[PDB]
Write a protein that binds this ligand. Structure first.
Ligand code: CDP
Ligand code: CDP
Ligand code: CDP
Ligand code: CDP
Ligand code: CDP
Ligand code: CDP
Ligand code: MG
Ligand code: MG
Ligand code: MG
Ligand code: MG
Ligand code: MG
Ligand code: MG
Lengths: 132, 130, 132, 130, 132, 132
């Protein structure tokens, strides 16, 4: 059951030099890069589209400002059950063994985004890779 | 608390160049090698025995087919509470932090086997190390 | 949510050459060293104070002997939610992903101490770094 | 001392699951990504250009054949003395401590390319990033 | 140009827990295990055969005593130019980047043996794997 | 051939979160910590003494400023041929395999100091650990 899912490497990973570390954890779990873009600075409307379901929250504006404060990488990964597996790999800051659990300690600056559903996956892929 | 357990390193570990990575995780938790064998290709007889409790399942023969498709290493490890601790180290493909959690993504090609009981262990050690 | 916590690196870490491995796991999660002392052999008095709540237990004296059988490092660490996070990082010998989860397999020789509460942390800092 | 250089991650890196390992070694020495592109299959045109200085050699077409046999990543890196330092990081299959030294074992499938001069760099960056 | 070569993991690697580390360095360089034996204690005449060209040196007896002080693993590795490549990977205690250069600091207890010639390779393989 | 040497961990290691990485490389080569001090900011006097042979150079004052711009750790290390081995481990920003070779790219900010001779080592130990 192959799926594809959208990942973003966030500006705190560039600042802290953790880009290969995060990418390597997904690589070691046998997921493949199908497409990839580097953005020295992502255009703000792409970020706002990406986070559109969050538009009414108190943190919305501040988080977009963080996301435009440095480089980001967008990646489409392919593999069995990709969506849910990469989501678990991302985890959270309370859970040792995961990316966030081992390397992050903040509510905003948490290194990585992964799609959490099939629909969000489909939509997020179309935002960052509209040539399809 | 001393105990011995049986581990198999599966053909996908050789294919993917992950043999030392798996062994190193067990080494780091302070478990010691008691015996070990390299098999370039295992006799199907031994595999069928090792998985006898599984002989009536849809997946039985496909899994046997895979277990003979390349090399395997069989190892006896020893340490305090070795059976349960090494089994936890093995984990599953759903749980990060474990061997299968960090490295494997399939129902069949999952890198490693560890005995799950005192009875499994005695019986599996005897299969691979008469 | 900035806090301070007390960590001890135990003699077994020195014996098994795991000192930097342990310190690196805390470092990578973004906690900072605030003060540090190396003890080639800790004064028994300090260990007895440190484990006072355990004085009535049957393992008290044996543990004390172990803590005195090689070097220890005492560290004060700072960061958001430090007491609770460094405790999760410490873990237990059952669950992989943690320091103890990955590296230890003993009830006594388990590599690391971390404070487990706001009260225990203030006291433990005063034992090891009385300069106040 | 600021400088920019052109790196290719070759198809064998994808085959062997070594892409993050290579990138991480460059990251650790404090070099920064300036631009980067993923190619699922590179146009042979670009490869032939990239290796134009090599067009009269026995190995030329076999090497081109390999460079199109799977994905590649092209990256521009920047830092103090980037050309020489990243080239040293790349090393060769004979010298341990370098990327090729630790990880590669072949004359052709050697994981990575790095520009070797200021002139190579200007020209290679222009090929992959017009 | 495929060759095969003989490697021994020495008792100091078991004592120091460096067996996977050493094996992993050879694995990462794309060499394959063709055969392998574990010896909880190698018989002394095998060691003495293996080191027969060393029989007249002052260290001969002492080194054999070291080699019988703990477990050893014998491995036949296959790959292009295996003999000379694995020899370089082994290196020496003065050379950072190699097994001995990163992990050893002794004239006797230096973690790893590798064959240094085609003839020695052929002979050493026949000592530890005489079923051929 | 047992010796002692002086190592300083520089402010850039703290800045870039490389403290345990550096200490781990020395640890894995089997050298032992004999004494250790953490300095959140080192007294300028100590740094001036430490780099006295360099007082006439054009980089003296800038270097001093850098050494005082964040924390440092001072370590005494013991082991066979320690002065010369820890120096090789330190390396230079050109050759991979070493701490500087792998992790640094600056003439000034280069992560680590190690003593380079028997005389420099005795002096440097007296500056940082005068207790004698
Ligand atoms: N208070 C908050 C909550 C979330 N956020 C950011 O918004 C992202 C999306 O919020 P979320 O609760 O869906 O988190 P995840 O789904 O990414 O775990 C987070 O990952 C944070 O980067 C923030 O900046 N401030
Ligand atoms: N659908 C399945 C289920 C199990 N198996 C194999 O059979 C082994 C034993 O099945 P199991 O559910 O007890 O798995 P574990 O105990 O090994 O997690 C697994 O490790 C798989 O390699 C399979 O090939 N196909
Ligand atoms: N049976 C026991 C239990 C604990 N201990 C030691 O006493 C320490 C404190 O006990 P504890 O149960 O509070 O353990 P942690 O909070 O450190 O997990 C442990 O870390 C052990 O090192 C022991 O020597 N024997
Ligand atoms: N016999 C050869 C020699 C070189 N080559 C390829 O051509 C590239 C350039 O040749 P080169 O000798 O300048 O190698 P490097 O500068 O990349 O070390 C090499 O990286 C190889 O991938 C080959 O395929 N077959
Ligand atoms: N003085 C010495 C010299 C060598 N030896 C041992 O004998 C082995 C063979 O000696 P050698 O000089 O051929 O060393 P390598 O070829 O293994 O580098 C060494 O690797 C040491 O383990 C020793 O125990 N005492
Ligand atoms: N041009 C320079 C040279 C050295 N230095 C600093 O002065 C220290 C001592 O100089 P050095 O040439 O003895 O270098 P090492 O012996 O530490 O390699 C270096 O490690 C640099 O941190 C500097 O700031 N600017
Ligand atoms: Mg969400
Ligand atoms: Mg089962
Ligand atoms: Mg407790
Ligand atoms: Mg060239
Ligand atoms: Mg020799
Ligand atoms: Mg100097």
């Amino acid at each position: 059951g192959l799926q594809r899912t959208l990942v973003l490497i966030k500006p705190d990973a560039f600042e802290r030099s953790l880009v290969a570390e995060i990418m390597g954890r997904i690589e070691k779990k046998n997921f493949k890069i199908v497409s990839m873009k580097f953005w020295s600075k992502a255009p703000r409307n792409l970020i706002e589209q990406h986070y559109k379901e969050h538009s009414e929250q108190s943190y919305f504006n501040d988080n977009c400002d963080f996301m435009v404060s440095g480089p980001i990488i967008s990646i489409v990964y392919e593999g069995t059950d990709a969506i849910s597996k990469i989501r678990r790999l991302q985890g959270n800051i309370l859970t040792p063994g995961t990316i966030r659990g081992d390397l992050a300690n903040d509510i905003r600056e948490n290194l990585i985004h992964a799609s959490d559903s099939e629909d969000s996956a489909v939509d997020e892929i179309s935002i960052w890779f509209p040539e399809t």
